RNA sequence: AAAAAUAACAACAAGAGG
RNA sequence: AAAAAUAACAACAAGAGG
């Protein structure tokens, strides 16, 4: 009877993925909420009628330097409240969070610094992870449910990477990073929506632009749908489509038993 | 209202995103569309009226200053 | 009262289902039968009278125009 | 003044078991003895003097007017 | 105030011990000694001055009528 | 207006250490420097300014007598 | 009135005041201006604070009138 | 579509409450799992066909000397596993816990020392409260869903009692007891099933045998259905029937959106 | 072998409730209905066979012998 | 030995069994065949599971030893 | 013993991609090159000798039958 | 050849020993009996522990052979 | 054991650097030096003795043939 | 039988600070008192008794050689 | 590393102790908070610079009849607040409480009657102890941390004072006075600053004026620091120096790891 | 109250310290753990029953050339285990490690090469420091708490050395020697026992054998106790007595709040 | 972005935001 | 009362019960 579908694809710039055919693909998937991260465009560029899917409301948060971040959210129904930012500096200024607010649930798009640039990016990533855990500690006192659709750029465990014995020193599989993820999923009660149904290997999300990596499936799993503990039993079907790619990232399509309302 | 309304009029005129902290502590993002002596409309997705006796603070998100 | 009255009259005449959030945080929801300088009469199962000094926000379900 | 006097006078004379919800969210069931501006006398075993400025809603228990 | 002052003066002259409730739910006990437009003087081991813009209800302990 | 101001003046003369209880339960001890009908100053180590609409009660520590 | 000479003394000396609101929120900063209904607190971003939401105002250094 | 009903009535002796017509009432309520606490009978005494409902499997955990505890469970479907005892001394010896394990959920029955006898009963109650909070802290990490149908004999909130200003010294509304239920529901993430549906006063469970408290509704709310956080959104209809009671306690009928399996 | 068989047979005759711990830390809890050299079947609600090579400890819930 | 009568009764009656392994993983199917060392069960493909990894074998319908 | 040998001979002779799940839950997916009564040799890139006592299940990919 | 004299020497004078299993689980108590496959430990109830689950057996008082 | 002994013998006649995976997933590395019915002597900086009832797999680094 | 008995005898003669690794990763330093077909005595502050079926590896801290 | 110095001394008269060299020793400590108990001096008597310490702010609370008691508090940090009186009759008319409120912490000097000059002072001390227990039970629910530099004139338990076997019925080591402290340091959950860094006796803070108490150490231990349970970890150094003392009581010097700010 | 007594002393030869009175002073301390660093003697030399003390147990680890190092360990409590050597080259044959394993806690006496008698000892010291950091990173996954009584021969910050400006290039306060400890106490995050009771310098643990160094206090601080996270609050008393000293180093005594159990 | 609502904490020197 | 399954922690002196 009731069903909901959330797609949280990362686009690596919305114009390049729109040239590679994102919007005509997203129009034909019947998603309730589409959660785009790393938009790389200001909000004055997304009210262009090329980015506008029909039957969808597009809400967008920009960065202060528009190539640095950017985040968008397509919604079937008009939400109760669309808010932006988290409060701390490495999220609010650089456009890495946007929260749509519905009847009982709320759906939040989330972007992170990748950490794969240098050591300054890794320090910014670690302070983002700590301040975001400080935010998530305060969220357990409220009753509005949350769905954080986030390109976290961090793998969780050894099944989420290929050949983990040669990945322990690259950013994305570090020991404080995996400590952060199993502190969020483990002790804070939050749930990975892709692992609540499909407990299988060889489900990857990110690939480097080397074609030999793409040919032999040398992948990573970076984007997640993090769920508040009340929503772990509603996950019907979570899947990462391997083939129809539009960036370095693959989409994440999760089908819930929830009935989304205003 | 000698000083109360060059401020809200400046927030209306430049479409500055404001956060209205109520006396509950509920914070409401939006942008000021109209205001009389008593109420203030904010427009996030659905436009709504907010009574000023329930408003604690009205902050802007980027620094604007008075005429 | 340059803007108090026509918004509530547009919610009243169009019979828009409206939602009043109180200063406690309580979400009342119904329809506006009538109002004055101090109260809103709210139509539901039974007609409440809500004082305006407890109303924090008045939120329509469909948007209205002056 | 206006609409609240006709409203409360009906709840007096048809003797209706009202419920007054305060600003801090506390319901007081009972009847209305009498009122004027910023008082309501709430009728119970002990008659209360409830200030109107501390009242959020007046909710009848039977549909009236 | 056409029915506030007879009620408070009847509560004062008969000296009924009251339970005066505040707007944040705090019960105070004692007896009424003086009421102005704005204040009510509760009396106990000391003499307070409560404000009428913080009082929710005034509850006597024994039932009295109105002259 | 006839009864608030003599009470506060009597608490000002004898410099009795008083406690102002605010509407959310906060007590503030000190002495009363001066006041108007919207404002009451308070003498602790710092000298602060209290608004009367946020005041619930004003209690003394010594029993005081009105003229 | 001592309210507006007190606020003028806080502004002209530029004292880093702390405004405590009626629900417990503490807000530091300096004062830009004030009206009958509003104070303005200046910081990283300048804000208006409605006067019916303020419990107390506390200066940092002990100033005189 | 799917539905589930759980009744958690306290009987104060199954032989004394079966004379007042409990079983002919429970047969006509269409309950999936019936959760009886304070049975005051051995497991050999529930073996006769007088307590046997038809279409219900009856599993019971007795006390050693039988008049102190005793706990029973009627189940529509035969559960996967019926286990007894928590693991410490003030539960396993006196028969105050029984657990029926099903497909994804597991429905448990919980009895407590009332604490209203004297000071030894209050010390035993505080020992049970701390050891059961340790049990919940251990069971927070497990992937089952629990439904603890418990006569806790502790009111949580001021709305859960009538005239609380003279109940702060009676056991049932103490400050360590309300701090315990503020710890279980507040910070441990557990949810009260009666408070998810109804958020209104004058819903009471226990009444002392003085009739003056009875006809004027001077009551208490003692038995709860404590829920793991995954089940806080399935709770449709929770209600305490006032009139058709069969002991000092009223039954607690909670209807869930869950579909109970084997 | 010659010490396991009288122990399990004494647990079978008296119907003592046992807790069979497995080698992966799972505590099964039932009654030993019968056994052989290699498998022990227990009954809680459904009878199940349990291979002895996956059993660590057989704990009775009350003393014996 | 009650190895062979219990496994033959789960086989010939064609009862859906659930088989819990030593690492905790359950395998639900029907016992197609069994040897002294292996158990071949069929859900989609024929699956050979060694008995040194079997922890428990539960049925869905209770069986009686012949 | 008397039933696993023709099953593994079938899995070799038809050359089906098997997946062997060990007793610690690790999938080794490949194709059976040979087997003794103590070992299995599989490959996808380099020929492994997986011990038989460390194997829980041997799951083929397409359904094959026992002759 | 070396096991059963050690277990006898350790079980006669009733040394409180700790049996460490292959999970890491330690079990304090004295050994009452043993055979080719089973040990039997006593702390609060005479449980039976299989030897293919036992990693080590460590006695408390340092005893000789 | 009629087909594991030629494999473990030709892993040391050519001295292939093997990676031996234990039953708890621990990857040991080295060169096989000798093998009994029960043990395998893994040669490295020091020559340790690995029991065959704790080994899951024995993989070579370069592919060989029997 | 062809290697483990001379290897553990070589570790018994010279007092080599041996380290036994169990199948769950537990690392036990010590010295080998004696052994048999099934069990190994370990020498430390206390004397341990470790069965062979739980032993993963037996590594020495000083490099030894077999005759 | 933080370092906050609080010296609590029961001077038995500030004029009687200043002639022994009180101010000259207290000026050369750089102490943050000075807690003077039992000053026997009025507020106007402390106004002259003979009792003043230069650079230290002084706040003092006297008695009505100034020969009975009164406390004083020095701090060079001007506090957020300072309050006098506990909130009942037999504490405000004696000057037996003075609490200086800084941010995140409060430091309160506390005086108790001796109770050794007849049964009337013992009954008044019992009244003070009972409603002080009521005051602490009220102050438990607040958030901010408290420090009570208190001369309780009561020992806790058996191994506290020397030759306790004849001290069973003398006032100061009675049975309800020990019941008071074992329920305060029991259910009410407070702690001491001297116990966390010194878990033994043989260190006292009260000697009668006699040469046998000077040499053979007939000592009692009275000057305590009662802590809320969110401050017991930061206790670093506690010092009761014997000969350097200008009164019957033994000066107490404590050093915490707290940063005392405005 | 727990009281565990651990002394870390660096003797520069146990006979050269015993001729000054090491054994007679240590026998009258009743210490639970004695860590003798740089014993400069073989194990058969410690088989002399003069070094056998009042019920202490001896465990010692020597070098090949025994004057190059060697550590020793005295304990009343017979431990669960005692282990020697970390597992690499420059620690096993030098006798530079000995860890005693009790229940829930372990102590470990540790010795480092000085690095001041040739640059080959400096490169040896850098090798030891690097694979010691690798060892600590391997040990971070374990549960049980470790105590490292060690002479690191390195200072940590600017507040640690005397005569600051020319100590930049001497071996002992170098730049990568400092960086080693600032990632150990930084990103890795261990703790120091000498800091947790004294956050101020002007206290050293090594003096060069010259008159100006022992008169005008030209000292360096070497004997440390490195603590894992988990043992950071239990330290109470760390004393470095100056004049009573049997080597160029200073003897260290510490008392922890721990129940040392077998 | 807010508990269709705690017959009511003789009272949180005050949650940069219930 | 048990993750239809971590191409695999050179290794947790050991979770009276993972």
Residue numbers in the entry:
A (entry chain B), H (entry chain A), O (entry chain R), P (entry chain S): -2 to 259
B (entry chain H), E (entry chain D), F (entry chain E), K (entry chain M), N (entry chain I): 5 to 71
C (entry chain G), M (entry chain N): 5 to 70
D (entry chain C), I (entry chain K): 5 to 69
G (entry chain F), L (entry chain J): 6 to 70
J (entry chain L): 6 to 71
From the primary publication:
As a member of the extensive Lsm/Sm protein family, Hfq shares an ancient structural core that oligomerizes to form toroidal architectures exposing several RNA-binding surfaces. The Crc protein is a member of the EEP family (Exonuclease/Endonuclease/Phosphatase), but the absence of key catalytic residues in the active site cleft indicate that Crc has lost enzymatic function. Crc and Hfq act together to translationally repress mRNA target genes. To gain insight into how P. aeruginosa Hfq cooperates with Crc in translational repression of amiE, we determined the structure of the complex they form on the Hfq binding motif of the CCR-controlled amiE mRNA using cryo-electron microscopy (cryoEM).
